[PDB]
Amino acid sequence: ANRMILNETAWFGRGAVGALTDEVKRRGYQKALIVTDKTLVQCGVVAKVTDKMDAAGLAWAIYDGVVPNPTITVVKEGLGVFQNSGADYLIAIGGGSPQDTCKAIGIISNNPEFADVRSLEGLSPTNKPSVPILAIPTTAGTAAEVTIGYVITDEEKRRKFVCVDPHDIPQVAFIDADMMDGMPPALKAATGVDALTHAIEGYITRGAWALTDALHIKAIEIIAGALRGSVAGDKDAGEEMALGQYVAGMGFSNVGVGLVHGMAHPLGAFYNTPHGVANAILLPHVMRYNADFTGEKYRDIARVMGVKVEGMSLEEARNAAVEAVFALNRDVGIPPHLRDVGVRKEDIPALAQAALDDVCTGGNPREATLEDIVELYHTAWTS
Amino acid sequence: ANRMILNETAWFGRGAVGALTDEVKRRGYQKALIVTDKTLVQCGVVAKVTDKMDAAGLAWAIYDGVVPNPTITVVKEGLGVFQNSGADYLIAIGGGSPQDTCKAIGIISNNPEFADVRSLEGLSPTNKPSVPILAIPTTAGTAAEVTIGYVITDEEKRRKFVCVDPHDIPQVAFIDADMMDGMPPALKAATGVDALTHAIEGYITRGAWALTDALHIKAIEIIAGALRGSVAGDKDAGEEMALGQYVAGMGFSNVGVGLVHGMAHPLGAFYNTPHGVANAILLPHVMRYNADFTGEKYRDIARVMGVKVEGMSLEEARNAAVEAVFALNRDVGIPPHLRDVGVRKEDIPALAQAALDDVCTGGNPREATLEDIVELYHTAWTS
Ligand SMILES: Nc1ncnc2c1ncn2[C@@H]1O[C@H](COP(=O)(O)OP(=O)(O)OC[C@H]2O[C@@H](O)[C@H](O)[C@@H]2O)[C@@H](O)[C@H]1O
Ligand SMILES: Nc1ncnc2c1ncn2[C@@H]1O[C@H](COP(=O)(O)OP(=O)(O)OC[C@H]2O[C@@H](O)[C@H](O)[C@@H]2O)[C@@H](O)[C@H]1O
Ligand SMILES: COc1ccc(CC(N)=O)cc1OC
Ligand SMILES: COc1ccc(CC(N)=O)cc1OC
Ligand SMILES: [Fe+3]
Ligand SMILES: [Fe+3]
């Protein structure tokens, strides 16, 4: 028997944030804490929301202390600001980093036992729902607005840990490509292939079933078709990417992912590597590694990614789907090897250990050994 | 900007009702009123739930006063039983009739200004969320467990009225084919083609967009592929039907349907016709009427319904999709003509008026006139 956690309410398309003032008035909320980062404030992205809230007469304080790969320190700082703001709800504005930080604050606020943060790892045994969250992504992205997962960095144990908890699901998501247009091309490409990694990994994960298969294959189709266009700055392509990344979240949240995310998390913890860039470099190599344990699913991936698989053997089709991902990586300007983003050969043993102990690795369709992950890192490292 | 209302939590597959006791304990609810009908009690379908609740020690009273095409009288009776039960939440067990009745009780309970019931018609301006509903369907399917819509019969004005309200969305849906297996073949076929009508109408509705298109086309594929098998009594086909009917609900709830539902509602009000039988007889005739206003969408329908469209013109493909639905109706034992279920030529003028004033008619891709609907009824009436 399979469980689906989704957003009760979500708005999609350009101008979707225009619905926020109305959703807040419907629920009777009094004051927001906006969780965001400094970049989004001084790009005027936060202003696009706070201007509408001022016009609607809705009170808000702001915490913009979030950094890429949010730390336990960041979570504690924000939790402190939330308590002193007298706010009764949360508005996450940004990529995975502010949205994951927002979820941590929301959970600990109503489950104060978890103030240390690192005790949220795995299936968080929280008694109480999160402080209500309204989620507004600015990356096409991590689907943080719809997933029941969030990833915090333990600076002292030098690892990223996943917390999975139905209590952290946002009440409303606003998926507005107007909020995402300010992404630099490199960021559109990184977060774009993070979305594709969620969809491919989710499609082949051990817990996969009919409904998540249907969602993931549609998300791969939307992302493969739109990402080149979005990175180039096309407006309609940006709107497609915004939807594609969300539809991936509806799936992988509820069944899981695999060794790509398992091997990407240690890279973030060790080097502060952008999550999408780590994922994008590993994805094709892990896809090749997983090929023989995926049944017919690489034929479907290859097809919706624009490959003619009419009269291909299964191994030829599996190779074609891997090659489709290498090509898309090349076109959107992602460095092809881990060496290129500052990963060090010396660390691979330690990284392979952390990858094997990651929550995401358990979902991988092929049972990965330390020997295998060490070899994968080395394959992804070279040149 | 498009809004999606979905279930925050849902369980799918045989044994899914096994998750109900746990969901109730998580939320801290004290006593249920089970809304159902007499048939489901004395078929032991309700027992499959209440036995698990007794084992978990969870209190419940029962209202089984629901009849096909539930009336304002039924709603008032149930609202009375709810008030005298001291219950704090609702469990809907049955098809569209109990589930729609449950939503009416839940809404009026917390929005008591709507005690007349008929003032819920259209976009219900309710201030308060429904009394929490846990939804367990026993038909395949009206998708009442996931839609924000419900249909009540006004005995005094002899018309069915649709109420659309995000506040009525159930907290949890349990989609268990074990609960649906006792459906007689005729009921599997009726509710089966009601699910197909939701998917086809939803696919071509005026408000249709990318995400609902993706959901509806997958639901048509699941239903076309499984309905003959389910009517024959196949267990796995019943499980597919259970998912297919739900996936249709995820779409049509959020964008609407068309003139099939518009023309089916008056038939229920006048003759107490089973909703699915009325829908199934009208669907192919309304599909023909709509054909020129649907873009490429009948090519997609035809394809996922098992028709080879590789080298077909658009008009030939549109004709093939209409013929696919006539054939599926023939195979599951739905008669071709409205005369066959007791519709009277004398009433067509009155029925055409009621159809034009139905909420669902506004979604129809071709703007329907009274003259047109009169002609459609006559076309659907006899050969
Ligand atoms: N619209 C935007 N315009 C400009 N800069 C932006 C925009 N959105 C985000 N940025 C900037 O991009 C950088 C990356 O932001 P993140 O929130 O880290 O982006 P994302 O890739 O969505 O998040 C990754 C995070 O999600 C988790 O799942 C994962 O483990 C990782 O911690 C930051 O400097 C942020 O301010
Ligand atoms: N598993 C089952 N086994 C046997 N009989 C069943 C089962 N489930 C339902 N029934 C019986 O089928 C008959 C029809 O039940 P409904 O609830 O009316 O069926 P459904 O088609 O799901 O609902 C139609 C209603 O919903 C609205 O969408 C529509 O406008 C109409 O009011 C009733 O006698 C009911 O007891
Ligand atoms: C285990 O599944 C997950 C793995 C990673 C994340 C964070 C992310 N968006 O990449 C969320 C998850 O869902 C619970
Ligand atoms: C207007 O849309 C609807 C019309 C009819 C129903 C009930 C049904 N299942 O036929 C639900 C709806 O969604 C809000
Ligand atoms: Fe990710
Ligand atoms: Fe219906």
Residue numbers in the entry:
A (entry chain BBB), B (entry chain AAA): 3 to 385
Give verbatim excerpts from the published study on this entry.
Here it is shown which structural adaptations were introduced by directed evolution experiments that changed the catalytic properties of the Escherichia coli (E. coli) (S)-lactaldehyde reductase [EC 1.1.1.77]. This enzyme, referred to as FucO, is also known as an Fe2+, NAD+-dependent group-III alcohol de­hydrogenase and is involved in the catabolism of rare sugars in E. coli.
The mode of binding of NADH in the active site, including the nicotinamide moiety, is well defined by the electron density map, being the same in both structures. The mode of binding of the substrate analog is the same in both structures and well defined by the electron density map. The observed mode of binding of compound 7 is possible because of the N151G and L259V amino acid changes of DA1472. In particular, the side chain of Asn151 of the wild-type active site clashes with the mode of binding of compound 7.
